């Protein structure tokens, strides 16, 4: 019983644990912001993000798999649970500034989880990690 992973195209990254299934995408588009949303610091912050047990667990399993140091690494954003807009958690993965050291660490993560990933993040430009619950693809096995 280990969460399923799927690689498609380059940009179409997929994951499934239990009943929940997400889509990890990288782009400069912004949907989550501080004060406006939630600030996940440690994996006990994530439990008030979703109501489903597999939706909370897969998100915390994915962040411990990439090597997100809950002490050293900067906190990330999430969508309030009592929100109909859905489920989405955003990780600032910009390859320039203060998050440059974290972005290259997050860049090597995808190179060991999804094995091969030519990063859709621009080294020296704004880039944001965004996971949204999608359907399990037809092409993706199991």
């Amino acid at each position, epitope marked *: 019983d280990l969460p399923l992973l799927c690689t498609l195209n380059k940009s179409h990254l997929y994951i499934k644990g239990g009943n929940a299934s997400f889509k990890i995408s990288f782009d400069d588009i912004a949907v989550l912001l501080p004060e406006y949303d939630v600030i996940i610091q440690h994996p006990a*912050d994530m439990s008030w993000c979703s109501k*489903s*047990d597999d939706q909370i*667990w897969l998100s915390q399993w994915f962040m411990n798999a990439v090597g997100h140091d809950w*002490y050293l690494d900067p906190p990330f954003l999430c969508r309030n649970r009592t929100k109909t807009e859905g489920f989405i958690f955003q990780v600032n993965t910009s390859k320039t500034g203060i998050n440059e050291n974290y972005a290259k660490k997050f860049k090597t993560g995808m190179h060991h989880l999804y094995r091969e990933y030519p990063d859709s993040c621009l080294d020296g430009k704004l880039c944001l990690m965004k996971a949204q619950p999608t359907s399990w693809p037809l092409q993706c096995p199991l």
Partner: antibody
Amino acid sequence: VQLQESGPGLVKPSQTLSLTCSVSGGSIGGSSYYWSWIRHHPGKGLEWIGYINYRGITHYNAALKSRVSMSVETSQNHFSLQLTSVTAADTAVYYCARLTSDCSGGNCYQAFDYWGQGSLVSVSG
Amino acid sequence: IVLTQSPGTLSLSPGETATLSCRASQSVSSSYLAWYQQKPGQAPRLLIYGASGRATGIPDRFSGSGSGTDFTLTISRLEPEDFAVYYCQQYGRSGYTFGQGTKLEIKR
């Protein structure tokens, strides 16, 4: 809902202290349910150690992360606490709790509601 | 992050209201703060959750309040069975740090 602590009363220094907490009332974890260990020094305040989830998700204290491991088994409903290279400054009263982060409106990620009596651990040779 | 609970000891008469302050060094956006009650030779119990709401089976004389740094616990109509040690907790910079503690002495 009840909690029970079981471990050695006296553990020699530079060795490993191990305690196991018994969940009574329900199955181990679920949505917004974490199981922690809260230490209590002689005079010196309460210190939180670390937690574990229903499917085994851990996070520990900054000073304890280097020598603390925790385990869990949902089959018989018990969770662990393992601290290596014990010192006299690790002499305290170990309580086991339930973190939880479910609510009604705001402040869902909240604090420990259920606690055990706690076992006194003395660390001396 | 630092939690300071004041005063050290609160010796008050039953019926008279008791106010406990808990100041934070860094500005806490609440929710993590929760009050505790540890009666002599017993396990501590949750009083207030998210610094506002009274816990399960906890009376309404116990009232959680505050925002930012100063957070206040208020116990109105005191009784001799309300003698305990009170603590305020917080998660900050990876670690659920707890408060100093105020031992409330019920007078007679």
